[PDB]
Amino acid sequence: MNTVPFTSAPIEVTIGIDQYSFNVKENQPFHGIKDIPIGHVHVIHFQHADNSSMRYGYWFDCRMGNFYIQYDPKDGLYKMMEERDGAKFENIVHNFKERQMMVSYPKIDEDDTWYNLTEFVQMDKIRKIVRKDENQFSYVDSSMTTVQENELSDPAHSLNYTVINFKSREAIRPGHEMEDFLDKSYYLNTVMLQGIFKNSSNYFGELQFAFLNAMFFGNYGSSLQWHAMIELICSSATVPKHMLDKLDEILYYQIKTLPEQYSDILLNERVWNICLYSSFQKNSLHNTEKIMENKYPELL
Amino acid sequence: GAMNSSNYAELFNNDIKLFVDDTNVYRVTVHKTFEGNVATKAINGCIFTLNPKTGHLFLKIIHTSVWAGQKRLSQLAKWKTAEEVSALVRSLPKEEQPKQIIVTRKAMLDPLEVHMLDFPNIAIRPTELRLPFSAAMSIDKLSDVVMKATEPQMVLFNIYDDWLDRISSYTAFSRLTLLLRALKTNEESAKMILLSDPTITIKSYHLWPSFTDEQWITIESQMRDLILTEYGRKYNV
Numbered sequence: 060m061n062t063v064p065f066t067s068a069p070i071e072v073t074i075g076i077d078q079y080s081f082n083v084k085e086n087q088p089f090h091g092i093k094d095i096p097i098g099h100v101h102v103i104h105f106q107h108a109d110n111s112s113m114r115y116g117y118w119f120d121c122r123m124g125n126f127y128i129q130y131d132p133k134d135g136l137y138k139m140m141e142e143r144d145g146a147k148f149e150n151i152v153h154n155f156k157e158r159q160m161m162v163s164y165p166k167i168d169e170d171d172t173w174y175n176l177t178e179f180v181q182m183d184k185i186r187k188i189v190r191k192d193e194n195q196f197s198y199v200d201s202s203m204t205t206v207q208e209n210e211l212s213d214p215a216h217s218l219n220y221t222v223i224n225f226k227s228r229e230a231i232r233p234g235h236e237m238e239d240f241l242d243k244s245y246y247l248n249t250v251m252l253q254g255i256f257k258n259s260s261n262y263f264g265e266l267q268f269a270f271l272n273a274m275f276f277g278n279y280g281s282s283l284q285w286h287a288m289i290e291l292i293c294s295s296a297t298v299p300k301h302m303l304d305k306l307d308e309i310l311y312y313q314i315k316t317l318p319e320q321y322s323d324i325l326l327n328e329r330v331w332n333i334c335l336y337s338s339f340q341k342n343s344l345h346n347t348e349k350i351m352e353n354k355y356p357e358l359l
Numbered sequence: 360g361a362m363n364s365s366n367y368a369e370l371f372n373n374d375i376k377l378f379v380d381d382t383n384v385y386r387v388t389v390h391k392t393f394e395g396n397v398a399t400k401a402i403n404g405c406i407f408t409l410n411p412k413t414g415h416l417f418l419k420i421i422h423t424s425v426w427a428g429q430k431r432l433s434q435l436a437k438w439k440t441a442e443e444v445s446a447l448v449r450s451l452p453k454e455e456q457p458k459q460i461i462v463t464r465k466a467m468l469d470p471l472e473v474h475m476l477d478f479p480n481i482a483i484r485p486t487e488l489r490l491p492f493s494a495a496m497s498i499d500k501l502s503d504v505v506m507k508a509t510e511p512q513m514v515l516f517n518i519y520d521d522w523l524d525r526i527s528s529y530t531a532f533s534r535l536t537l538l539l540r541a542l543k544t545n546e547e548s549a550k551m552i553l554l555s556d557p558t559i560t561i562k563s564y565h566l567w568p569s570f571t572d573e574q575w576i577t578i579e580s581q582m583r584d585l586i587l588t589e590y591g592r593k594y595n596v
């Protein structure tokens with residue numbers, strides 16, 4: 060079990076760690092989060108009490124280094140930093156553990172939620188979507204735009220998701236216009252899976268990462284990407300059976316975790332009604348259809 | 360974006376544009392079978408592609424053989440229309456290619472956009488005008504060439520005859536839409552109006568009769584009366 064030490068908490072802030080969250084008061088004696096499960100990526104995220112503008116946060120994997128959070132009063136945000144001195148980091152973590160100044164990652168033993176949401180998410184793939192090579196962790200916030208959004212403006216601060224566009228020469232083979240537009244199997248299997256992602260695990264990893272950035276930061280472009288990656292599969296007549304079964308599991312846990320009161324802004328009615336009721340895969344997503352109909356029957 | 364009454368003079372500017380109407384591409388007669396079921400029999404159709412400034416009409420005849428063994432014909436017809444319009448653009452010299460294609464039915468937007476991806480600078484637009492181009496098959500010389508075709512064929516027409524020698528393209532388009540609207544509303548009476556007087560003939564090289572300027576005014580008034588008469592008959596007014 061790993062630990063992220065806070066130098067201090069000088070401003071009142073709601074802190075998220077994965078799907079959990081807690082409030083810290085201004086100058087409260089808070090020094091970090093312990094007992095973080097090894098084996099998964101994690102996200103530590105922030106919303107300031109005096110300015111809910113800019114949710115922001117950091118994706119990290121404790122296997123890649125020792126990281127900590129330090130409030131920067133000039134840039135006005137909790138910043139993630141790597142500690143290169145392992146003996147110092149162990150020493151700081153131990154004293155704070157002894158003084159009980161840390162919250163414990165509150166994982167219930169029965170509870171596979173975080174694994175189910177991050178099954179295919181790898182830190183190395185995050186670091187290619189979020190380009191800041193000098194750090195082993197990745198910053199994301201509510202306002203960052205995607206490469207695709209910028210094409211339709213600072214490129215260094217962009218989310219480089221894979222561009223999906225159904226009315227593009229990449230998606231449509233000359234001579235197969237009707238075929239490829241009505242059945243996206245070519246675009247899914249040849250262009251995206253074989254060509255760009257190499258395998259379905261990488262495709263699902265990006266899909267899961269997009270959902271998590273949408274949910275945790277309200278990042279609009281991330282929500283667009285998540286829906287586009289769902290629609291691309293659902294609008295293909297030929298999809299490997301193992302991908303359909305895995306997608307149903309992925310989406311089920313995403314819909315289960317979504318806050319009920321954010322459904323209006325995180326779910327696209329057109330995409331979901333098309334995917335569940337009109338698409339080639341309308342009968343392939345049994346678990347997702349069941350939870351959607353029981354939890355969000357209005358949207359449908 | 361969409362084309363409506365606010366930007367109507369745009370149709371007659373110097374930017375090359377074409378209307379595409381697909382309403383006569385897939386045509387059928389519906390009938391009973393020996394067993395008392397219902398079946399369709401296709402008949403030859405056509406794509407109506409018109410330059411409203413010049414009157415140039417590219418009439419692509421759609422022969423019934425293109426439907427043989429195909430499914431979902433109403434859907435396929437939109438994609439075949441888009442394919443043929445795309446082929447038409449690629450065949451035209453660069454300086455003749457349109458800068459905009461206006462489709463009369465919104466269901467043609469995606470098929471045509473997808474077929475024209477290679478032409479990102481040609482705008483594909485809908486229109487809020489209700490244009491009566493479905494009635495093109497009421498023009499006897501157009502109906503004749505479509506029905507006689509034994510294979511796919513492109514037939515080239517000027518739908519304004521020689522009118523642009525005497526009137527503007529705005530006025531010619533208004534005359535055309537009035538004639539077609541009348542033929543759509545009451546075909547028999549419209550043809551009666553156009554042919555009643557044997558001394559005014561259709562030249563071998565024309566689609567419509569050789570009316571003088573004053574006779575066109577009379578004809579246009581008779582067409583407006585027909586449309587109004589039929590409106591009163593329809594709604595009991």
Ligand SMILES: ClCCn1ccnc1
Pocket residue numbers: 064065066127128142147148151
């Ligand atoms: Cl780990 C060295 C930085 N640090 C973290 C908490 N207090 C100091």
Ligand SMILES: ClCCn1ccnc1
Pocket residue numbers: 415416417515516517
């Ligand atoms: Cl040749 C009659 C005029 N026209 C029609 C289409 N291209 C030319």
